Amino acid sequence: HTIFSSLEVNGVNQGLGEGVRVPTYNGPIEDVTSASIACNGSPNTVASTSKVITVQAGTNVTAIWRYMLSTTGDSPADVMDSSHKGPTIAYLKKVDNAATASGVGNGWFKIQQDGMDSSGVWGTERVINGKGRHSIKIPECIAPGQYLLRAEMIALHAASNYPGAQFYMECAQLNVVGGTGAKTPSTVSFPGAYSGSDPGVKISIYWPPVTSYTVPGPSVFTC
Numbered sequence: 001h002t003i004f005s006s007l008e009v010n011g012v013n014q015g016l017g018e019g020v021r022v023p024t025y026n027g028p029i030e031d032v033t034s035a036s037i038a039c040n041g042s043p044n045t046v047a048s049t050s051k052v053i054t055v056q057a058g059t060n061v062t063a064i065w066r067y068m069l070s071t072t073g074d075s076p077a078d079v080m081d082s083s084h085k086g087p088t089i090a091y092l093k094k095v096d097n098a099a100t101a102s103g104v105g106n107g108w109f110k111i112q113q114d115g116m117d118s119s120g121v122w123g124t125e126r127v128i129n130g131k132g133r134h135s136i137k138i139p140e141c142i143a144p145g146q147y148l149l150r151a152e153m154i155a156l157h158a159a160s161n162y163p164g165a166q167f168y169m170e171c172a173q174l175n176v177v178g179g180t181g182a183k184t185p186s187t188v189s190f191p192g193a194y195s196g197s198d199p200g201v202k203i204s205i206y207w208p209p210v211t212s213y214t215v216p217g218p219s220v221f222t223c
């Protein structure tokens with residue numbers, strides 16, 4: 001249970017819910033086929049925002065994850081429970097209007113992923129125990145204009161069977177400036193990318209203990 005409530009650019013945070021469609025409840029979407037898998041949604045309620053953050057291509061943004069919108073601290077308990085072990089992912093979608101685009105369907109291409117490392121530490125354990133910071137790279141070769149950043153952190157403490165995995169995600173509104181458009185990513189669709197039978201969704205992380213993890217979705221897009 002957590003929420004990506006605020007995003008940081010030029011080293012400064014843009015504010016709670018400013019440029020980020022946030023849910024009022026920190027509940028996960030468990031039906032990968034449901035339209036809410038893209039940018040959250042029913043049975044949760046997501047608020048709208050009319051702020052499009054101006055980011056210059058090539059630079060990092062950092063998604064701040066928080067146990068609740070009213071959360072004020074940054075301790076491991078203020079981000080998410082320690083049991084919520086799993087990967088952390090980020091996508092981008094080219095839209096005409098980041099302030100109103102739904103974000104459901106084709107157009108998503110992966111840009112960051114942090115699953116299990118050689119030591120066996122999950123990406124969530126670093127966001128939780130790293131003050132909720134989820135650093136993400138904005139490529140330089142994509143085209144400039146409006147975009148939708150979909151940060152995500154999945155928990156697998158009960159994904160032994162499907163339904164079981166817990167998908168937490170919130171989408172941010174961006175305006176990429178300076179992109180050289182020197183490459184066109186091969187995009188996927190949300191819903192459609194994840195499947196209940198994928199090795200990353202359906203998985204028993206304790207019986208037996210896992211050592212290699214397969215982050216769902218496509219490969220990372222690199223210029």
Ligand SMILES: *[C@@H]1O[C@H](CO)[C@@H](O[C@@H]2O[C@H](CO)[C@@H](O)[C@H](O)[C@H]2NC(C)=O)[C@H](O)[C@H]1NC(C)=O
Nearest residue numbers: 059060061062111112113114134135136137138
């Ligand atoms: C910008 O974001 C990228 C990822 O989008 C960060 O790169 C990761 O950094 C961690 C921490 O050292 C490494 O463990 C990963 O291997 C890196 N992945 C990639 C693909 O580079 C990068 O550190 C961020 N930089 C800033 C300044 O925020």
Ligand SMILES: [Cu+2]
Nearest residue numbers: 001002081084
């Ligand atoms: Cu939870």
